Amino acid sequence: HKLLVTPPKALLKPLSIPNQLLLGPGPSNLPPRIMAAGGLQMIGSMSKDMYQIMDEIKEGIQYVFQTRNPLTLVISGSGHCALEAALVNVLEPGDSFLVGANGIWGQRAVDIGERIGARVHPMTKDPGGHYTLQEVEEGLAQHKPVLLFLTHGESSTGVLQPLDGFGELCHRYKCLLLVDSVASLGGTPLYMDRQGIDILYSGSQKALNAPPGTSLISFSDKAKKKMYSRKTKPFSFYLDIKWLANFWGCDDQPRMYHHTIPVISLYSLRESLALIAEQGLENSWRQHREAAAYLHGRLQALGLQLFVKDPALRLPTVTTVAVPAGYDWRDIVSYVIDHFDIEIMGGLGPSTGKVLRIGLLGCNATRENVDRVTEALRAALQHCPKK
Amino acid sequence: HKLLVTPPKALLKPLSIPNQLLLGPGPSNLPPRIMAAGGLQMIGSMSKDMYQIMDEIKEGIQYVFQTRNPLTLVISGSGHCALEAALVNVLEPGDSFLVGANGIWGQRAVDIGERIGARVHPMTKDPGGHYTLQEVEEGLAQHKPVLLFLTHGESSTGVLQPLDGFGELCHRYKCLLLVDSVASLGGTPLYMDRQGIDILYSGSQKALNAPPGTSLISFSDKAKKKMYSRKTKPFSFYLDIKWLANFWGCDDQPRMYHHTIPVISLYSLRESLALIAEQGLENSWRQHREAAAYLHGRLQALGLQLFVKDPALRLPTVTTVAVPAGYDWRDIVSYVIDHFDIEIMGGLGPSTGKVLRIGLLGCNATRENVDRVTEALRAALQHCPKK
Ligand SMILES: *Cc1c(COP(=O)(O)O)cnc(C)c1O
Ligand SMILES: *Cc1c(COP(=O)(O)O)cnc(C)c1O
């Protein structure tokens, strides 16, 4: 007895949130349908009905990845968590692991790869750079790796990465391909099977406009063959693919309790996958391409220059803009949220302080929101200090 | 081009869920306020306003743990994820790790401990058993471990575990104490600092009645000293306490992007911590003790016998009931959900097939719901096959 801690006074106020228009690299704003799914009641986490939803979510990930892999499921964690789940289950220690260290996502693949004791060979490249099929055949040949990691949408630098044939290249060296489509999914063409991709993951909170906290993953039979014949148990129980696979109905064995899935986020995820199914993929890529074009046009009208020179290399979901001469970037960003209720972002990792990041994602990739962010940025340029 | 996968027809139907009354070991039903928090709009995952919520959540975990540890935060994952985060950050490989293998939660602590390459010494005990301060001083002495794991609320067997002095015992052998309060928090007395606990974690989805997918953790300065002087980097980047700690404002350094936290679940978690703050802890323990008493009474009226003989050892949030002679347990459980819209559960792991599990958690631990489950179970006993 004798209770030390008293009820925090801050908790006895009611919860209240500002209305913000989020137009950075993520998370993005939720449409009404995702919100309505968020406010539903709980069902049992192993109920027949829960399985039925999970199966729909599967079919959903199969559509947006354009894959038919049986080993396709949701990771109960953020984008980082899917990446880690991928790496920890594919890589035994000491294995050869090649990584396109293009921006932060490469760096994290490194960090994680290091952490789980693999021999990681970093093809590091300056921010704004991208990798040709040569640079990767070169790396493939001289390091002879079991797995390559590539960022599709590089949201720290705004670089779209070409993907055609790279999957074939990697098979040619008996290697596995791992693609990060967290920023790219729903916004720019992507076909898992036809591009021969072995591990694809994405996030809930970008173009799909679901709340952050889940992530999507799918494994080819090749990578699936490895995982089921690795001789050591992976370092995570939480992310263990065999346990995971069984629970999501990707096995021959009935579903056995592994962990409690985030039921409510799954309602929302389902709905987000439904919305893009109804619209259809090619229309979503079309929407994002036309919006990003519109935006690009407007920023250059303001005398800003787009960080990535080549337009065919610019990521449509996340645009990098160079920090104009004589401006503190923090001043501009502050001004935008302070005076317009709009969130945009600066750089991240190697792109830090050099760029501004403006995202168009899903239901937010509209000409209306491009207008709103452009005016905000006009105002800042004319009202922020200049040296 | 040439798109292989077509929009799943199942996704083009609208989402719909059955109303169920969940009265197993978790998840539990959400009150209206948690639901309303679920349906809110997104704010930026690194906004000043998001930090402010996270700080309230901190103060919230400090209250329900009754701790003042600065190293207190949320894990973006399920109950299992907190456990793993605890173990992966405390234990370097080869370390001596003692675990009360009382039910499944011990077994998982084993599995995980094994996975991260520690020398795990399992004090295995038959289901329904609990550990005295002797059995643990014995184990402490002969294995000399750096960390002990104990389940407080053992939801697979319904055993409440005594905790007073065990923290002192462990310090006496220079050891660290790890407690699982996932099932027990909010339902039965628990004081982190006064019981000298070094690592406490719980779940969102039990007595707190938030949606599943986040979990609560707190570290004493002792365990915190270890983690900051371990010589090897842990096997997970996702759960790395230094990265985590920094982002949740538990550092001297400004918050640096680690991963995107589940913003919406955090709204809900906050509200759940507010609701128990307003009610007050001791009233919640009182509610749960009086409900579990009521329930116990009613089941014995039906001629069922409570799995745990000693009442002072029965977990109030999760009651184990022996499977009556001549009944298929699956028949009963089915009958309950089929005819009453009520979920109860069977055993789990070592308790499988031997028991029925009935949970009372938070806003659901009411005399009203005890009535409803008792009648359901009357009906099943009189309407299910008997050998
Ligand atoms: C935002 C982002 C991530 C990280 O996802 P989290 O949900 O923060 O874990 C990973 N990859 C890319 C390309 C991203 O844009
Ligand atoms: C339900 C439960 C867990 C597991 O939590 P998840 O949220 O399924 O990861 C762990 N410990 C106890 C005591 C539980 O009751």
Residue numbers in the entry:
A (entry chain A), B (entry chain A): 4 to 390
How is this structure described in the published paper?
AGT is a hepatocyte-specific PLP dependent enzyme, belonging to the Fold Type I family, catalysing the transamination reaction between L-alanine and glyoxylate to produce glycine and pyruvate, thus leading to the removal of glyoxylate. AGT normally localises in the peroxisomes and failure of its detoxification role leads to increased levels of oxalate, coming from oxidation of glyoxylate, causing calcium oxalate precipitation in the kidney and urinary tract. Many pathogenic variants of AGT cause PH1 (primary hyperoxaluria type I), a rare autosomal recessive disorder. Our results shows that two forces generated by the salt bridge between the conserved aspartate residue and the pyridine N1 atom, and by the Schiff base linkage act as opposite springs and are responsible for the fine tilting adjustments of the pyridine plane of PLP.
Automated crystallization trials of AGT-Ma usually result in diamond shaped tetragonal crystals. We collected both crystal forms at the Elettra synchrotron in Trieste. The tetragonal crystal diffracted to 2.5 Å resolution (space group P41212; cell dimensions: a, b, c = 90.7, 90.7, 141.2), while the orthorhombic crystal yielded a high-resolution (1.7 Å) dataset.
